[PDB]
Design a protein around this ligand. Sequence first.
Ligand code: CLA
Ligand code: BCR
Ligand code: BCR
Ligand code: 1L3
Ligand code: SF4
Ligand code: SF4
Lengths: 58, 29, 129, 772, 31, 80, 133
Amino acid sequence: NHHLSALFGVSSLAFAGHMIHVAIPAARGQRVDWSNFLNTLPHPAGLAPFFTGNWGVY
Amino acid sequence: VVSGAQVAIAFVVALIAGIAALLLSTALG
Amino acid sequence: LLTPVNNSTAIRWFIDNLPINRVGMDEFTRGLEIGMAHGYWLIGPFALLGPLRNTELGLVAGLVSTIGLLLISTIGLSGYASLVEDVPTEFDRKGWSRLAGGFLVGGVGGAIFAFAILQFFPLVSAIAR
Amino acid sequence: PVRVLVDNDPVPTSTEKWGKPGWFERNLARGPKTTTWIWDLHALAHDFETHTSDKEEISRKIFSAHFGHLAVVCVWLSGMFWHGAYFSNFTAWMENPLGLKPSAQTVWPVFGQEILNDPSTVAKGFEQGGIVITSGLFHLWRAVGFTTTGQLAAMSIAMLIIAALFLFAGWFHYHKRAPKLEWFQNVESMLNHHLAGLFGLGSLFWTGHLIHVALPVKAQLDAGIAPAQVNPFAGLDYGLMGQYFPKGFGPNGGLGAFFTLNWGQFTDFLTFKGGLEPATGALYLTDIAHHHLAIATLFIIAGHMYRTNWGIGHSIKEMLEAHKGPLTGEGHRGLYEVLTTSWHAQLAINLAMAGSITIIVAHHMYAMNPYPYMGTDYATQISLFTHHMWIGGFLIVGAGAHAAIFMVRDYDPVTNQNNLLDRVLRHRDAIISHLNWVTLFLGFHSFGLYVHNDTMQALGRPRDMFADFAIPLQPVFAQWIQNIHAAAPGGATAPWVGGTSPTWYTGALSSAATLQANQVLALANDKISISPIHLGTADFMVHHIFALCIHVTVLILLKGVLFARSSRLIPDKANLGFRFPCDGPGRGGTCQSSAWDHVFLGLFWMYNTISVVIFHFSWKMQSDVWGTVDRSTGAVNHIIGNTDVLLGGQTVALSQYAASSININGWLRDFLWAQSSAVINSYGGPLSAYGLMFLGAHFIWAFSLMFLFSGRGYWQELIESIVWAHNKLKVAPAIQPRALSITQGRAVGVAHYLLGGIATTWAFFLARFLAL
Amino acid sequence: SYNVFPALVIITTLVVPFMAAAALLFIIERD
Amino acid sequence: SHSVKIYDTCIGCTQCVRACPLDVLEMVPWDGNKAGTIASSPRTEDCVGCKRCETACPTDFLSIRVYLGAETTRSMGLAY
Amino acid sequence: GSTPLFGGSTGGLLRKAQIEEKYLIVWNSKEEQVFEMPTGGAATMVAGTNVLYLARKEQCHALHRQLVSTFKIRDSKIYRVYPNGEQVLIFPMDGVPSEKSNPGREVVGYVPRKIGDNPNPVDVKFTGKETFD
Ligand code: CLA
Ligand SMILES: CC1=C(/C=C/C(C)=C/C=C/C(C)=C/C=C/C=C(C)/C=C/C=C(C)/C=C/C2=C(C)CCCC2(C)C)C(C)(C)CCC1
Ligand SMILES: CC1=C(/C=C/C(C)=C/C=C/C(C)=C/C=C/C=C(C)/C=C/C=C(C)/C=C/C2=C(C)CCCC2(C)C)C(C)(C)CCC1
Ligand SMILES: CC(C)=CCC/C(C)=C\CC/C(C)=C\CC/C(C)=C/CC1=C(C)C(=O)c2ccccc2C1=O
Ligand code: SF4
Ligand code: SF4
């Protein structure tokens, strides 16, 4: 239960977090690092489409 | 660049990993 | 009192196999290894921070400086060795005396060897040029 | 379980005991036979534990004595407001805080001492002038909103009422309603009330003064209204509050914004600025108000942590018993019993903290000046730093004394079995020998650098020195910390902090010599309030001197605590007490082996410590920070001004601290000899009292050495021949003259050594900075 | 006219004090 | 070892014997005082010279006297 | 008997206790109870015979003073232990305490005069004889 959910699942979820917050903006030419990632939206609508189920905005 | 201060910092971090490895390897034997 | 600093196993193995404690050594060879270790590193502060450090004879001055420091240290150790009287083999009077002789030979030798490395380290890359 | 147990009228209020001094202790109650009795009376008078074994009676005396001390402080504060009200130029200083020197002590004209009244304090209302004061009281009173001397007089009267209230409660809670012992042991209730009530509501009520008095008074003085015309109740009128603070006191109403949690309206008068206001050189008052509001919230919150009478909260005893490990035995078990049954254990902690906080106050006040225009009052800045450095050093030594008194008097082996206290005692030889080593390391590798530099300079070898112009020892860790804090306001880790102290901004410079006017904070009198403080080789060297002096002072005081009860020398030292001269000339000689004698020796090393700190502060600020700016060149002219280091001879320009403080001859010539010219030339003018105090303190210091260097057996034999001459002429007294005891002779010596040495520097500092 | 013997300074101020200290050590520590 | 001498002014109060942290001293029977006893110093090789015995002695000028003599390991109070 | 319960300290025996002399203090205890070590720290005495090795006689006599004043334990015995292994009883010597007078002791250190009748130092000049003879 722990290796599937956390060691595989959460680690993969965290990597999707790295790709969306850091690696995809770097490919766009936008430098996101520790000094600015708290104040940099990975998407302009940020987290409002996620909780309301309107997921196609992403 | 990696300045000379950062090389020295890296060897201090490596020394701490070295004593940690020393603790583990004697507890294992 | 029994502490983790007093009781670590590969710390105990290391100290037990330093040449002052290592089983099977003669006190001369004990002193020889100790001197070679100390004389090697001792030239470093003398050569790099001494008064002639910015001239071309700075290494030679640091070498003769280190030999002077080891000779005075040996006077204390050889004098200690003549006066101990206390315990058997390594703390024998002759035992400490052979250590004092080995220390000076190794010490001067360690400084000369460290001198030669610092004076001729360009040679280790001389093949490429 | 938290109740109030009080015995009613336990002690009758009568003057019968005043006819018999020394009634409280069994040796002294037999009356004087020798002069030793006279000194014994004073030394034992506040040692309440020698007077009785009843712990409850000791706790009652302490509680009542605390009210008497608070009444003394309030009388002292009442006097400060009185002398500000009636014997000061506060009215003229309020109109010109940068042009007139503050004075609140004027001198009667007999024997010619009215020479101590000086012009540059003479103004209207204060015709004769007076002594320039360096306590900073005028800057504090102006900051908290005092505009007139009639307001200071009402504050003087209020402090006398608080004093008479405090003094009455000391009579009340000793002679009328004295609490029982279990009332004092309610430390969870005491911490709840002192955190939430004293510190929490004290800060919250002070925020209310800051919001409704200090902020609108400053708003009126910044508008240009003269302080005689300033309405002090202007912060109580909501309409007049509206014009200074349009958002916080607006149509979007003030208390309406509070209860709807619309606190963003309040950013008019509550900010997060951080830095100093460029006109006053001081912190923003809206920052100070938000500070006290934020720490009031945290302190009121902190005062609900401990369990009293409603189930919830922490039990300290169960918390201490849980924090134990394998490396530390039984851990913090028994420390609850120590700290609730030993007044000395609590005093040792609370003196250690109060002394350390007072030192933090000294550092934080110069660098983050809270009071407008005080940063250009250099004699005030020097005095306040030095005063709180001395107070903090004395209290830390007292922490060492009462930790030792705890070990002699209140330590119990049954309470401390394999706990933290028991395990420290079981390796006291390991602690002290390592502390012995590190003081020797620090002393060789810090003071020896100065001696190296003295010798290299004398031998004509300046390239062999430890200096910025030679072999550098850069303090790279402190420069790194300065870089972090320079970048932090507006940067990533404090994005909405608008500034910080200007001392951090040393990025961007490699010496104080190359300082331009845009980097410094100068006021309208063109004097520098504060600047970036460059740290170089000289600051590396003097900081390891600081580390030496602190570690030796720790070594002496901790050796006194850890060996208070026993040593390999004296195995039953605890039976001799805290304060005994020796155990005789045997065992080689055991003079000064008591824990008291470590406090005696620790006072000199505290003296040595604080003397270096304040000498460092004085020279470094004069050479690297303070001075004048020129409106041409953007040039920073420090008070001292830029030595040229020869070296080649291609001259190298450094600040005088960086060029000269790296050896002892520089400290002797450029600091002590050069800056004493004010105090030794002060005669015939108004600083002549400082010249007299400078000479008189040298005398007292020298006089102390008679006591420190000699022994009482000489003096007792000398008294014998003198008592013979009084015996011969029927003038011998019944109270037989004795030489001072061995311990008292040490105490007299260290008191006069400290008094003479500290007052010398006081006269030196104040004559230096009030003359230039 | 600068008449010094540097080797006499080295011998009399460095060498024979260290040797006198060694000699004095043998005197005070023997037996 | 220090010399601990007892003079004939001893009143046999035993206060020096109780004061001594090394058990150097003891009371033997005597006839020179009303107590019938006098301090004695049989074990002065343990005497450290602390003079606690002299401090406890009540007679004007004292009946017990410690003379600091040759120093030993015992008399210097060394645990090493 | 056995050692008191003590976790060890740095204030105990040194190489003198291996090469010159150490000291042994023996006492009986009726109750297991906590006492302060003269070395520094707290130990617990067993309910039985207690033996403790100490560096000096003064440390042994200090513990005996603590055992009398605090715990009413009277019967403490102190031995001097030599490095070959010999024990010599040194306290109490004759079984009777030192403060109580005992017929059978010899008077040692007695000078049959008051202290102000000692001879002058000029009288004993050029001899090892002292004025306290
Ligand atoms: C909150 C602070 C505080 C409190 C309540 C105490 C309380 C106590 N201390 Mg502690 N102590 C403190 C801080 C404190 N101390 C500090 C800061 C130090 C370092 C200096 C000490 C160091 C210390 C020692 C070494 C000793 C004590 C002792 C005591 C106890 C008895 C005091 C007494 O009766 O002496 C009587 C007081 C006097 C006779 C007056 C003192 C006068 C001083 C020495 C000189 C004043 C000169 C002045 C500064 C300048 C005047 C010059 C001018 C007139 C020309 C009492 C428990 C004693 C004790 O045995 O505890 C059980 C003891 O031996 N304290
Ligand atoms: C192991 C080792 C070591 C060690 C060594 C040692 C052990 C040493 C010793 C040392 C010593 C052993 C020293 C000695 C010294 C001595 C001296 C320093 C002396 C002095 C003297 C004096 C000062 C004199 C005085 C006097 C007298 C006595 C009498 C007459 C008069 C007079 C005054 C002259 C080393 C480091 C090498 C390293 C390796 C290993
Ligand atoms: C890091 C580390 C470490 C180390 C440290 C150290 C401190 C080291 C040092 C080292 C050293 C310090 C080294 C040295 C070396 C030396 C040598 C290598 C020498 C040689 C010499 C020689 C070869 C000589 C010869 C001679 C001559 C010349 C002449 C006479 C004779 C003779 C033979 C003597 C350890 C392991 C602990 C651990 C891990 C980590
Ligand atoms: C209101 C007022 C002030 C009235 C006057 C009060 C009346 C009547 C007499 C005043 C006596 C006073 C105040 C002091 C004399 C103290 C004294 C016997 C000093 C000699 C002495 C010296 C010089 C040391 O170095 C020394 C060192 C170590 C141990 C002991 C000593 C020692 O004992
Ligand atoms: S000199 Fe003074 S302090 Fe030292 S042992 Fe003798 S009486 Fe005690
Ligand atoms: S000097 Fe000390 S050890 Fe010697 S007999 Fe007197 S009290 Fe005992």
